[PDB]
PDB file of C-alpha atoms in Angstrom:
ATOM      1  CA  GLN A   1      98.518  98.582  97.734  1.00 19.22           C
ATOM      2  CA  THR A   2      95.206 100.234  96.937  1.00 22.39           C
ATOM      3  CA  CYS A   3      96.144 102.711  94.219  1.00 19.76           C
ATOM      4  CA  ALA A   4      93.203 101.891  91.938  1.00 17.33           C
ATOM      5  CA  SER A   5      90.809 103.361  94.503  1.00 18.39           C
ATOM      6  CA  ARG A   6      92.347 106.774  93.783  1.00 17.58           C
ATOM      7  CA  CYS A   7      92.221 106.618  89.991  1.00 20.94           C
ATOM      8  CA  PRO A   8      92.409 108.781  87.966  1.00 17.92           C
ATOM      9  CA  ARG A   9      95.474 110.109  89.812  1.00 14.81           C
ATOM     10  CA  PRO A  10      96.736 107.923  92.663  1.00 11.82           C
ATOM     11  CA  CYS A  11     100.453 108.577  92.441  1.00 11.92           C
ATOM     12  CA  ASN A  12     103.158 111.220  92.396  1.00 14.47           C
ATOM     13  CA  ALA A  13     103.808 112.651  88.942  1.00 16.82           C
ATOM     14  CA  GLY A  14     105.798 110.410  86.681  1.00 13.82           C
ATOM     15  CA  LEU A  15     104.553 107.273  88.396  1.00 15.50           C
ATOM     16  CA  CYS A  16     101.743 104.951  87.341  1.00 18.35           C
ATOM     17  CA  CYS A  17      99.287 102.819  89.331  1.00 19.92           C
ATOM     18  CA  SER A  18      99.799  99.121  88.634  1.00 20.23           C
ATOM     19  CA  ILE A  19      97.189  96.358  88.455  1.00 21.93           C
ATOM     20  CA  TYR A  20      98.601  95.055  91.747  1.00 24.31           C
ATOM     21  CA  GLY A  21      97.851  98.293  93.577  1.00 22.47           C
ATOM     22  CA  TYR A  22     101.217 100.051  93.811  1.00 22.72           C
ATOM     23  CA  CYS A  23     102.665 103.208  92.314  1.00 22.06           C
ATOM     24  CA  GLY A  24     105.966 103.056  90.442  1.00 19.47           C
ATOM     25  CA  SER A  25     107.935 104.149  87.415  1.00 16.55           C
ATOM     26  CA  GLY A  26     108.880 102.909  83.997  1.00 12.39           C
ATOM     27  CA  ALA A  27     107.388 100.351  81.698  1.00 14.29           C
ATOM     28  CA  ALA A  28     107.322  97.986  84.671  1.00 16.67           C
ATOM     29  CA  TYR A  29     104.370  99.963  86.121  1.00 19.37           C
ATOM     30  CA  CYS A  30     103.140 102.000  83.156  1.00 18.70           C
ATOM     31  CA  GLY A  31     103.101  99.435  80.334  1.00 20.69           C
ATOM     32  CA  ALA A  32      99.811  98.052  79.122  1.00 21.16           C
ATOM     33  CA  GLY A  33      99.967  94.735  80.880  1.00 21.68           C
ATOM     34  CA  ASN A  34     100.948  96.274  84.191  1.00 21.62           C
ATOM     35  CA  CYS A  35      99.114  99.610  84.313  1.00 22.40           C
ATOM     36  CA  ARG A  36      95.702 100.260  85.853  1.00 20.56           C
ATOM     37  CA  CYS A  37      95.589 104.058  85.586  1.00 19.63           C
ATOM     38  CA  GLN A  38      97.795 107.157  85.550  1.00 20.38           C
ATOM     39  CA  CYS A  39      99.601 105.409  82.708  1.00 22.87           C
ATOM     40  CA  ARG A  40     101.175 108.620  81.399  1.00 23.37           C
ATOM     41  CA  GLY A  41     102.462 109.721  84.802  1.00 22.14           C
TER      42      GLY A  41
END
């Protein structure tokens, strides 16, 4: 819920921090319109 506060690396490897504050995988989290940071896992 607060992943952006831990940019540049909020998540486990392979996951990305979304604009809504959660870590997750795939284009759903890592794509430009969804990704805050850690957008290459």
